[PDB]
Amino acid sequence: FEPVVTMEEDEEVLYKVRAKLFRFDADAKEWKERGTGDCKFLKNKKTNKVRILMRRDKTLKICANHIIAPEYTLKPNVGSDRSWVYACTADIAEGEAEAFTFAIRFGSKENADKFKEEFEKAQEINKKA
Amino acid sequence: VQFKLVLVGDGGTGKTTFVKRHLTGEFEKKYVATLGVEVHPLVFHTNRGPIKFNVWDTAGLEKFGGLRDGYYIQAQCAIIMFDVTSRVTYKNVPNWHRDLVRVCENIPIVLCGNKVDIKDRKVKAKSIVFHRKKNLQYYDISAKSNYNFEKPFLWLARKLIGDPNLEFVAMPAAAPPEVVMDPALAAQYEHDLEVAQTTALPDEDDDL
Amino acid sequence: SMEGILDFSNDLDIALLDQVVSTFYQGEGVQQKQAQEILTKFQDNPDAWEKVDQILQFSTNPQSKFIALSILDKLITRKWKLLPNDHRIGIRNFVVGMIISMCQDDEVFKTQKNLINKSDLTLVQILKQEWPQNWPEFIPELIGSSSSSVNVCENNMIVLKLLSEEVFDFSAEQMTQAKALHLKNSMSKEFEQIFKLCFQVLEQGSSSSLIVATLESLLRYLHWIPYRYIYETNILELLSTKFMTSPDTRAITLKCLTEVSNLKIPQDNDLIKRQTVLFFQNTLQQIATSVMPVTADLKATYANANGNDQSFLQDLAMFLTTYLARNRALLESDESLRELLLNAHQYLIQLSKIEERELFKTTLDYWHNLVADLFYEPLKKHIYEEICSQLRLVIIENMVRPEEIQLYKSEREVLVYLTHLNVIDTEEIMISKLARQIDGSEWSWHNINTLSWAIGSISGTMSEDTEKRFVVTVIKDLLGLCEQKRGKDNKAVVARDIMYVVGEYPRFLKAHWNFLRTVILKLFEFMHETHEGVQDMACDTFIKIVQKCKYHFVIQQPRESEPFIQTIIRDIQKTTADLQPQQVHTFYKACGIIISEERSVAERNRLLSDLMQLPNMAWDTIVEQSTANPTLLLDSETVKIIANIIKTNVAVCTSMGADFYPQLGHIYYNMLQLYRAVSSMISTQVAAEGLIATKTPKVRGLRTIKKEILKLVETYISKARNLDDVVKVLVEPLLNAVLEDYMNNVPDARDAEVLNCMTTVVEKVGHMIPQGVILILQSVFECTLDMINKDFTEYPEHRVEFYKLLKVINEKSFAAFLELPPAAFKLFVDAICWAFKHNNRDVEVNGLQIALDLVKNIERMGNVPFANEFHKNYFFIFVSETFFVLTDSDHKSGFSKQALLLMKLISLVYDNKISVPLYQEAEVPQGTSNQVYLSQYLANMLSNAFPHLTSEQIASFLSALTKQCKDLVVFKGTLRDFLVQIKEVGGDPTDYLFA
Numbered sequence A: 001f002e003p004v005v006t007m008e009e010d011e012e013v014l015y016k017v018r019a020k021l022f023r024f025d026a027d028a029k030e031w032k033e034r035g036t037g038d039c040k041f042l043k044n045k046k047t048n049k050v051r052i053l054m055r056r057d058k059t060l061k062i063c064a065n066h067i068i069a070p071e072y073t074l075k076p077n078v079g080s081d082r083s084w085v086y087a088c089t090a091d092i093a094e095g096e097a098e099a100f101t102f103a104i105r106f107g108s109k110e111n112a113d114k115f116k117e118e119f120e121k122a123q124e125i126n127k128k129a
Numbered sequence B: 001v002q003f004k005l006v007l008v009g010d011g012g013t014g015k016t017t018f019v020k021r022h023l024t025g026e027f028e029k030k031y032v033a034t035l036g037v038e039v040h041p042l043v044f045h046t047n048r049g050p051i052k053f054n055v056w057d058t059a060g061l062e063k064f065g066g067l068r069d070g071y072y073i074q075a076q077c078a079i080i081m082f083d084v085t086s087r088v089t090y091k092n093v094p095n096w097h098r099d100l101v102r103v104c105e106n107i108p109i110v111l112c113g114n115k116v117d118i119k120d121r122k123v124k125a126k127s128i129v130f131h132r133k134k135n136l137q138y139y140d141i142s143a144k145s146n147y148n149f150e151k152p153f154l155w156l157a158r159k160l161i162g163d164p165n166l167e168f169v170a171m172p173a174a175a176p177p178e179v180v181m182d183p184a185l186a187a188q189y190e191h192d193l194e195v196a197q198t199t200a201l202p203d204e205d206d207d208l
Numbered sequence C: 001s002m003e004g005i006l007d008f009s010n011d012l013d014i015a016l017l018d019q020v021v022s023t024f025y026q027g028e029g030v031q032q033k034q035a036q037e038i039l040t041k042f043q044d045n046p047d048a049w050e051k052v053d054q055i056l057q058f059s060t061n062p063q064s065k066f067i068a069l070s071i072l073d074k075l076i077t078r079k080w081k082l083l084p085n086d087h088r089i090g091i092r093n094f095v096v097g098m099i100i101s102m103c104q105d106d107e108v109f110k111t112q113k114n115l116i117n118k119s120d121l122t123l124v125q126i127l128k129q130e131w132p133q134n135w136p137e138f139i140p141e142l143i144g145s146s147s148s149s150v151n152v153c154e155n156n157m158i159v160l161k162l163l164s165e166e167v168f169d170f171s172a173e174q175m176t177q178a179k180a181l182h183l184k185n186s187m188s189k190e191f192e193q194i195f196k197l198c199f200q201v202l203e204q205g206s207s208s209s210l211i212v213a214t215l216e217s218l219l220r221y222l223h224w225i226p227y228r229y230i231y232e233t234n235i236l237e238l239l240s241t242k243f244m245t246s247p248d249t250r251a252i253t254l255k256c257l258t259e260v261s262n263l264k265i266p267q268d269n270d271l272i273k274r275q276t277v278l279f280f281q282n283t284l285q286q287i288a289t290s291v292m293p294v295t296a297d298l299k300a301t302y303a304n305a306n307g308n309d310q311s312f313l314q315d316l317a318m319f320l321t322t323y324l325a326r327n328r329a330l331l332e333s334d335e336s337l338r339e340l341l342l343n344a345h346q347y348l349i350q351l352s353k354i355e356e357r358e359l360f361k362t363t364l365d366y367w368h369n370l371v372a373d374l375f376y377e378p379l380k381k382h383i384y385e386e387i388c389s390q391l392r393l394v395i396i397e398n399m400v401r402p403e404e405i406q407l408y409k410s411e412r413e414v415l416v417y418l419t420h421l422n423v424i425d426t427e428e429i430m431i432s433k434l435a436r437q438i439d440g441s442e443w444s445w446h447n448i449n450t451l452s453w454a455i456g457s458i459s460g461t462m463s464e465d466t467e468k469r470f471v472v473t474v475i476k477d478l479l480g481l482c483e484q485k486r487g488k489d490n491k492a493v494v495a496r497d498i499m500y501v502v503g504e505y506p507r508f509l510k511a512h513w514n515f516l517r518t519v520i521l522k523l524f525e526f527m528h529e530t531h532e533g534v535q536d537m538a539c540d541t542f543i544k545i546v547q548k549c550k551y552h553f554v555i556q557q558p559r560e561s562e563p564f565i566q567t568i569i570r571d572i573q574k575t576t577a578d579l580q581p582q583q584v585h586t587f588y589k590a591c592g593i594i595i596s597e598e599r600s601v602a603e604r605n606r607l608l609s610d611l612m613q614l615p616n617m618a619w620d621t622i623v624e625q626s627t628a629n630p631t632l633l634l635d636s637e638t639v640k641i642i643a644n645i646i647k648t649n650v651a652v653c654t655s656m657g658a659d660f661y662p663q664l665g666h667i668y669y670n671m672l673q674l675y676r677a678v679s680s681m682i683s684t685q686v687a688a689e690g691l692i693a694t695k696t697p698k699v700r701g702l703r704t705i706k707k708e709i710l711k712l713v714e715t716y717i718s719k720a721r722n723l724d725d726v727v728k729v730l731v732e733p734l735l736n737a738v739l740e741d742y743m744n745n746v747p748d749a750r751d752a753e754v755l756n757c758m759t760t761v762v763e764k765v766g767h768m769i770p771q772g773v774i775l776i777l778q779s780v781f782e783c784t785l786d787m788i789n790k791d792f793t794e795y796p797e798h799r800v801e802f803y804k805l806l807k808v809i810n811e812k813s814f815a816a817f818l819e820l821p822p823a824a825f826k827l828f829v830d831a832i833c834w835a836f837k838h839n840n841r842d843v844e845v846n847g848l849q850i851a852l853d854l855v856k857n858i859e860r861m862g863n864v865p866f867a868n869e870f871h872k873n874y875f876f877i878f879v880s881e882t883f884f885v886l887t888d889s890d891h892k893s894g895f896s897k898q899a900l901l902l903m904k905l906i907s908l909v910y911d912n913k914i915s916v917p918l919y920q921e922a923e924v925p926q927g928t929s930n931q932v933y934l935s936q937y938l939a940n941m942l943s944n945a946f947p948h949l950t951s952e953q954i955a956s957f958l959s960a961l962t963k964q965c966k967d968l969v970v971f972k973g974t975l976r977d978f979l980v981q982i983k984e985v986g987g988d989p990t991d992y993l994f995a
């Protein structure tokens, strides 16, 4: 009897954490939210390269997409014990690679310290590759 | 596919804030009244391919009204916005609806009660019935908390595409390029990073 | 070159306007934006209307012609009465001529609906100005022109629809009372002829687009026309048969029949009752034969969203619920109408199954009406037994979380009523839904959650015995479910739901001490589970059970060695060891609820001492070490511990109120010392690091300490019974600790919570601390005013708290304003008017209330110098500031309180309750009454503010206002009439005689 008729599949999830991402707008000299949702460290199973991939709640639109470059440095923000600011030279969330000053804030200092730990582990992996 | 969407409703109800959140992810705290209209493309990725809304974000203040119903011509869909913390904004919903449907006779329309994040709600659930006889979809939304913030567009997408199973899908995520640090911009970045580190992140008492 | 249209010195280039318009509507980014600004400037040019004739004749772009009509509409609605009669007839004839021309060209009529509809609205704006006094033939000519052409007849239905809307539906805010009544009487006088045209079109038939337009106009007529047009003509038969069979007319017809169901109809007349029954029968008959049978799966149809199905099913829900809420008693007695009654309800049951939140709420409002009626009305429930049995399943399967307050409330009330009507049927449905969770067939987190919410919702409806058997059954079944399930995700969902159900059955817990004790000990075990959500639901369930069963924790239960509150307190360290701070606060709050049940003071105070043991010991060590070495307060961890100690005190004070006093007394003096120590560190840090310091985690932590101290004092004082102790013990140290600190900090370091704390202090004991209230004003008044008087946005919290404090000071200790130096009292009046100009409702309402209260406070003083000086200095300031916010269109939400204040001010003069002349000497004959001078001042002020008003309009308005200053609704009517007239030229001054 005849019966009735993302581009993340190549990647291992190294780390996942809820976060709010900001970009600095020097013109207004003010932080602007870029998105809230799961920040993921994705290791490409072909190149062994680790990127940050962050998608907004509800819409799942990309708010960060960049290599965790070995040359990046996580710096505290004056206002927060649970945030990192870093320069990103090439983020492709909005298509064309752009430089940004990012800030990413977590639910807790613990989450932010863990993020820094993982971000450094990712920098080493990217260094070897 | 592209669809003209007109956003109408009283001044300060959150029309521009809502659209900006959707365009850039930012939450604008400042009230800068729209002058006439601001038009922005807004794309969503769906299981049926991309949908583009031509968003005509109109002025709700009478003195900044510009072309008023002139903005509504060839709209294919609409959001009527009010503020659940401001009763007058709900009282004016029939006036916005009237002006809109006189120009756009047969379009899917969502009524949005914005600012449900605010504890002291003045337009209570039981009061909000205007949508029923007008066949409007209704959502409680917060541009601030993102409560139901995708629902108006998802509902309109389903209505315009004529597919009630249409979902928003994760927009594909291209491999990002490897970075070459420019030695000439070294001192440039130190500056910019300095300023950013010493500007406080907003809303340090929020969950994120 | 697009800016060429903005040059009115030359003639208007139509091809250029069409370019600008095309660029706006079809263009993109930069080009669209430039065209936008040019079009907006063109449209707002006050001479632009002169160009409309030229645009309408010579443009090829329907968008240009649309914008041309927008320009004409501005002229017609605002400045029309300035035009010579000849020009008004010219314009009227051009508009009518253009409409007929577009309707007579079939291609244009088909393809230019936007332009025709906008043309029709422009015509209606002209009828609002000229009809019927200047256009008596309009309706006979429209009716005559209707027979010339189907397109013209259809378009005339659109015109009549818009006219009905503008006169009856939207007149209330847009016209004077007098003009609205005039147009309503005018339409009412000619409706007989209009109805004859509509009825003849509906009978003679043929064109669906014509029939639909006629039915759209009828829907509007139904808002106001007498029932006899519907009941004493064939139209009910036509709507409920012919127009329901074709889908083109079905949507509008159903909306018409919904409104027919709302007509004011004689109540005592058997012919009308039969007709009301007949149209319903006819309608349902057409639906069952032409659309779908009673059995049809409307959930499936709606989901599929084919054509206009969703709107049709929404409209059917609106029709059935409207008709049945009014008429179901007509169908209930006659056994020959039983099938119709139950089929109509069965359609509603099917509609209730649609997955559409807002449609569900529509049907639920109706079900609430029905089951409330069956609970009370004799000999009725038996009719609906099968409808009610289905509805039980529908409500249970749709139960939402109690967080959805209104929807949960509606659903619970319907399910309570239904449970009362048949407790066995409800129980059976819930037990068998539970069996489908246990057998896996219907298992999901959503499904076990919704079922638990439904089971919880009917607590209190069964007899205590039936409930006992039901709860035991449900808890055994949920426990079995929990065992069955693999992995703590699943087990945690079921444990949550067990916790939820138990918390909703306190009558059961109160009867079964052993079970209650076990539940509490199990919640204590769950307070060690790190699995997400488990600790929160354990703490949430704990406080909920305690709120309901607190008495069972404070007595010695038979076969216990002590009250269980002692057992909780003894083990509190171990119980709360794994909780987050917010959970700990909830726990201590719950313990406070129990301890407040103990009415023996010695025992209550001992329990409170015991409960507060760990925060008090942590506090004592910190205060000793902290005072020994003020350095230790720079430690981030210590600041967090202190904040958490103060928040634990707040939590326990929140549930104990007046009973908290001995605990407040243990920490009070050292808490105010800490407030000063923390204040110095903040001031120090801001000086050393800058205003940025206030964003730092350390300073925010220090400020949290100050805010929680203020919240603790505010919480206690708001609930204090012994006010002598508040004044004698608490107030002086509080004011010494907070007031100078608030004054002497830079604006960015001042806590708005200080103002909020002082509001409570003045509210509760202001009458007893006249010197304290003066100190409060001296400390906060000028420096807060200076923070909030540069714009409407800066320091939003301070703004709100500032007017709350002034309001309560003005209510309780008005003497403090009497003691202000003249210059400061001037700032007080300036502060109130500033609040009036705020758009923020919180500040605006308080400002108008302060003004009203201040007028009352001055009035109370009687004929003394201060009151006479007040009126000479401020009476006209308050009258003119109030008129400003009434008339500037930016403060509409304040309308009612503006009107109340203006009526108070005018009644003072029209009663002669002001003892001195308000006018300074040699400004008016020295005899003159304040009444004459007020009339004169207002006439002058309104003439200057609204130069386009005639003297007669202003005089008639003010004559009405002063006559009506003892009748707020009418006074307000006169104010709204004035707000309409200031938006136009040539408003009728007789409008202000409206009665």
Ligand SMILES: C/C=C/[C@@H]1O[C@H]([C@@H](N)/C=C/C=C(\C)C[C@@H](C)/C=C(C)\C=C\[C@H](O)C[C@H](N)CC(=O)OC)C[C@@H](O)[C@@H]1C
Pocket: C471, C472, C475, C476, C479, C482, C483, C488, C491, C492, C493, C495, C496, C498, C499, C502, C512, C515, C518, C519, C522, C529, C531, C534
């Ligand atoms: C008055 C008479 C009452 C009777 O008392 C009977 C008595 N034997 C039981 C009593 C039992 C009690 C009081 C505790 C129960 C009601 C509550 C729960 C929340 C049990 C939950 C699950 O086990 C949790 C799960 N194991 C935990 C996990 O891994 O993840 C979170 C149960 C029954 O026979 C009757 C209700």
Ligand SMILES: Nc1nc2c(ncn2[C@@H]2O[C@H](COP(=O)(O)OP(=O)(O)OP(=O)(O)O)[C@@H](O)[C@H]2O)c(=O)[nH]1
Pocket: B009, B010, B011, B012, B013, B014, B015, B016, B017, B018, B027, B028, B029, B030, B031, B032, B033, B034, B035, B058, B059, B060, B061, B114, B115, B116, B117, B118, B141, B142, B143, B144, B145
């Ligand atoms: N609490 C809260 N505030 C909101 C929300 N959405 C917007 N706001 C704020 O309220 C104001 C709304 O400003 P706009 O978005 O410009 O308002 P608008 O309706 O576009 O105003 P017009 O352009 O004058 O018609 C801003 O201060 C926003 O930050 C919301 O969901 N919650």
Ligand SMILES: [Cl-]
Pocket: B131, B132, B135, B136, B137, C314, C358, C359
């Ligand atoms: Cl609806």
Ligand SMILES: [Cl-]
Pocket: C510, C549, C551, C552
């Ligand atoms: Cl009890």
Ligand SMILES: [Mg+2]
Pocket: B015, B016, B017, B032, B033, B034, B057, B058, B059, B060
């Ligand atoms: Mg705006």
